[PDB]
Amino acid sequence: SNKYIIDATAAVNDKIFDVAAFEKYLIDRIKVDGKTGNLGSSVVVSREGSSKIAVIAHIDFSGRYLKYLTKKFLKKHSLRDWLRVVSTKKGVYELRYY
Amino acid sequence: SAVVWMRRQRVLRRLLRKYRESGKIDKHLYHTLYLEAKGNTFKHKRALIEHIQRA
Amino acid sequence: KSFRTKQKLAKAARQNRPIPQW
Amino acid sequence: PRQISDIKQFLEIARRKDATSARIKKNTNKDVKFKLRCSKYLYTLVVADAKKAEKLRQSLPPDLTVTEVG
Amino acid sequence: MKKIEDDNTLVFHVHLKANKFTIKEAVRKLYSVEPVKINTLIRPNGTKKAFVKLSADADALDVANRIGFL
Amino acid sequence: LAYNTRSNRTRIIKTPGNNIRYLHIKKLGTIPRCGDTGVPLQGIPALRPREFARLSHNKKTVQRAYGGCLSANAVKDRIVRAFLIEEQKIVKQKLKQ
RNA sequence: AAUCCGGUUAAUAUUCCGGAACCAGAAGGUGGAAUCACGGCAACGUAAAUGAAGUUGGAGACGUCGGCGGGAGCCCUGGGAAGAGUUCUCUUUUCUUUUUAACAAACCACACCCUGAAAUCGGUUUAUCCGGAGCUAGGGUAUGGUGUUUGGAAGAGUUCAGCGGCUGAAUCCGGUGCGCUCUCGACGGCCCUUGAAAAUCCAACGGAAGGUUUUCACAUCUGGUCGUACUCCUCCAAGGUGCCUCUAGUUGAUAGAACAAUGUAGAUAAGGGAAGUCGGCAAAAU
RNA sequence: CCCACUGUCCCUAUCUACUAUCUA
C-alpha cells in the first residue's frame, strides 16, 4: 500500500554508500515484526535502479524507522559528520552532506 | 470502595433497565431485581445474569 | 495620580536641580 | 462575518455603495473565496467550480477594487 | 519621529485643559489638516501630550515640514 | 484588579498564537418568573436585563392574556376564580334582593 | 451597556499598527408589515402586529454544605509528521513541538401542555422521590448548558528546509481519568437569623386618541473627562519517588593564608557500668 | 526496686568542621 523511498543519488555519486550495500543492509536489518527477512507479501522492498531504495508495505512502516536504520549504517561507516539523513517529502528520505 | 460501588450500582441498574426494555424481565421482576440490587446482592454482573436465567 | 500630585512631584524634582553655571 | 451562499445577493451587495473592497482567495481545495468588505460586516462566499468563479470575476463591477490572494 | 514616518501620526504638547474635541479643531484650524484619531496622555511632569493620527489624504512628514519641527 | 472576587470569573481559552488567555465571562441571565406561582415562565429566553431591550416585542411576551407576567396555569386559575366569585356575588345579590 | 486576535518598543499595549467585531443614543431615507395581525385543542409560535392616564408584575436580587451530571483547559498516553539525539551491536528507540480568539450564522437536550386514568404499584437516584392536587406510556412546547457545521481563517502564528525579503512543506488521527483548575445544569440536606438596598431594563392590566401606525430589515453619524511607567495583602504553581529533577532565577553576603591552644557543635572508644553530682541532667539502649 | 543501656565517672584519648589567629 504505502510507499517509502530512500534516495541515494548523492551516495552513489560520492561512493559513500553503494546500492548493493544499501540493499544488503536493508535486507539484514529490516525488523519486520522483530524478525529480519519477515517482510513477506504485506511489505516488499524493491529498489528500482542503483539510485534509490523503495519499499511498498501494506502495513505501517515508520519513516523514523528508516532514518534510524539508515543512521545505524552511517554510524557503522563513521560518516555521520559528512552525511546526514533529511526528509525532502513525506515518505521520502535523502542523504545530504555539510 | 465508594468508586467500585458507584460503578457496580450503575452497571447493574443499566443492565436491569436494558433487560426490562428488551422484554426479558417483566415490570414486576425488574422492580424486584432493582430493589434487591440496591443492597449489593449480586457482587458481579455474572451473578445477576445467573439470577435472571434462574428466574 | 491626579494632575495636582503630578505637578507637585515635578516641582519636588525641580528643587534638587543642579545650579546653572552662569 | 456573515458567510454568504447566494451569488446573486453577493452581486447586489457589491453594487450597493456600502461595498468598499473585495478579495479573492484560492485555497488548496480548489475553492474560491470571495470576501467583500462592508461598513460593519465582512461577507464571504465559497464557490467550488472555477468557471462560475471566473464568470463572477467579470460580473463584479469594475469600480470595485478587487485583489488576488494575499 | 518614528510615529510620524510610520504611523502617520503627529505628536503635540497641548494645553492641559484641552480635550480630544478641542485638539481636533485646533489642529484643523491651525494646520488645515484632518485628524481622524486623537489619543491623549498626561506626562509625569503633569503636562498633556496628544498623538494626532492624520488621514490617508495627508501625510505627517510634509505637515511636519510645513510646521518646521521636522 | 487584585483580590479576585466573584466578578473576576475567568475562563481559560487557547488563542491562535498557541497561548492560554483568560476571558471574563459575565453572569448568565435569568428567565422572568411568574408573579403569582413564582416558577419561571415558559417561552422567554434568559438574557441580561440590559440585553432584553434589543429583543422584539413578540420575543419577550407570550400571545395570551397576562402573558409574560403570569403563568398559564396561574392565568387559568385566576380566570376561573374570578368567574366563580362573580357568580357568587350574582347569587348573593339575587338572594338579598 | 459594549473587543478580540496577530504584530510592534531601548522603556507603553485588551490603549499603538494591521485585521475583525460589539454597545449606547440620534434623526431622516429605502424596502417590508397592519388598518389597532394570524396560527395551534393546548403549552406557545412568527419579520412586523398603536396603547394615554391610572394600576401592578419581573429582572437587578441574594445563606451555607454534600454528592451526581456537562463542558473547557491543564496533566497522562497511543500513533502521524518534523528536527535534534543515542546507536560495534540491541533499541521501528530517546528528547522537543504539533494553534484557532472575540464575534456572526445555520442545526443539536429538565419545566409545562395534549391523549391517558394508574396499585399486581410503577418510573427512578450515587444518595427513594413523585403520582386521582392525575403514575408509567405516547405526542408536543419552551428553556440550549452544550455540541455539529462553517465564517472569522490562514493571508496569521509556530516548526522544519532552503534561496536572496522570497520560496517550499507540515501544523494530523485518537484514546482517555474518583486526575487538577474553572464554570454550568439537575438534586439532596443543614438552616433560621428563611437569607442587602438602590440605580437601571422589561412586561402585564387598563382603554384616552385616531392617511396612520410598524418592538421587521438595511444604509448613514458620534462616543468627552481621569488612571495607565516602575517597585511590592494577594494571584498563577511541572514531574518522579521527605528527597531528586525540569522550567525559571542566582553564584552574591569584604577577601586571602594557615589549621597549635581556646570555645561551640558532631562523632568513636578497651575494662567496669551511675561508683559521677543534691540527682540517670545530656547521650546510647527501646 | 529489678533488668538493660551508655565517656555521667574511674580517666580521659582521637578525629572533623566552625570558631579562634595573621594578612589586604
Contacts of E18 in chain C (CB under 8 A): none
What is the amino acid identity at position D32?
Answer: V
What Rg do the C-alpha atoms of chain F give, in angstroms?
Answer: 24
The residues that bridge with D21 in the sheet, in sequence order, are: D37, D65
CA distance, residue C19 to nearest chain E CA (Å): 20
Considering only alpha carbons, which residue of chain E is nearest residue C2? E46
For A92, residues 6+ apart whose C-beta sits below 8 A from its C-beta are: A4, A5, A6, A7
Q: Hey, what's the cell of E16? A: 492641559
F32 neighbors F40 (Cβ within 8 angstroms): yes
Q: Hey, what's the cell of F73? A: 396555569
> Which among A92, A82, A87, A91 has a CA at the least distance from the CA of A11?
A82
Extents of the domains making up chain F: 1-28, 29-97
The residues that bridge with A57 in the sheet, in sequence order, are: A2, A43
E13 neighbors E61 (Cβ within 8 angstroms): no
Task: For cell 456573515, name the residue.
Answer: D2
Q: Which of E17, E40, E45 to mutate to test the interface with C (most CBs of C within 10 A)?
A: E45
Q: How far apart are CA F71 and CA F74, in angstroms?
A: 5
For E66, residues 6+ apart whose C-beta sits below 8 A from its C-beta are: E31
Q: How far apart are CA A93 and CA A96, in angstroms?
A: 10
- As separate numbers, helices (DSSP H) first and strands (DSSP E) second, chain F gives 2, 2
DSSP element (H, E) containing D36: strand D32-37
Instruction: Give the resolution value in Å.
Output: 3.2
Edge-to-edge strand ranges of the sheet holding E35-42 = E9-13, E48-54, E35-42
Burial of E53 (0-12, 13-18, 19+ CB in 10 A): middle
Q: What is the DSSP string of A40-76?
A: TTTEEE---STTEEEEEESS---HHHHHHHHHHHHHH
Helices D50-59 and D7-15: crossing angle in degrees, nearest 10, is: 20
DSSP element (H, E) containing F23: strand F20-24
**CB spacing of E16 vs C10 below 8 angstroms:** no
**CB spacing of C7 vs E46 below 8 angstroms:** yes
b/e sequence E15-32, b meaning 16+ C-beta within 10 Å: eeebeeeebbebbeeebe
DSSP element (H, E) containing D13: helix D7-15
Extents of the domains making up chain D: 1-70
Distance of CA A74 to the CA centre of its chain: 11
Burial of A8 (0-12, 13-18, 19+ CB in 10 A): buried
For F80, residues 6+ apart whose C-beta sits below 8 A from its C-beta are: none
Phi-psi category of residue A49: left, alpha or beta, with phi > 0 → left and psi -120 to 50 → alpha: left
Q: Hey, what's the cell of A96? A: 545530504
Beta strands in C1-22 (DSSP E): none
Q: How far apart are CA D7 and CA D15, in angstroms?
A: 13
The residues that bridge with E7 in the sheet, in sequence order, are: none
For D41, residues 6+ apart whose C-beta sits below 8 A from its C-beta are: D1, D2
A57 neighbors A43 (Cβ within 8 angstroms): yes
Q: How far is CA F92 from CA A45, D5, F78, F79, in A?
A: 107, 70, 21, 20
b/e sequence F10-43, b meaning 16+ C-beta within 10 Å: eeeeeeeeeeeeeeeeeeeeeebebeeeeeebee
Contacts of C6 in chain E (CB under 8 A): 42-46
Point out the residue nearest to G12 (C-alpha to C1').
E41
What is the amino acid identity at position F92?
Answer: K
Interface size C-E, in CB pairs within 8 Å, comes to 15
Q: How far apart are CA B16 and CA B10, in angstroms?
A: 10
F34 neighbors F71 (Cβ within 8 angstroms): yes
Q: How far apart are CA F8 and CA F24, in angstroms?
A: 7
How determined? cryo-EM
Q: At C3, phi and psi to the nearest 5?
A: -60, -40
Taking the alpha carbons at both ends of chain D, their separation in whole angstroms is 18
Phi-psi category of residue A62: left, alpha or beta, with phi > 0 → left and psi -120 to 50 → alpha: beta
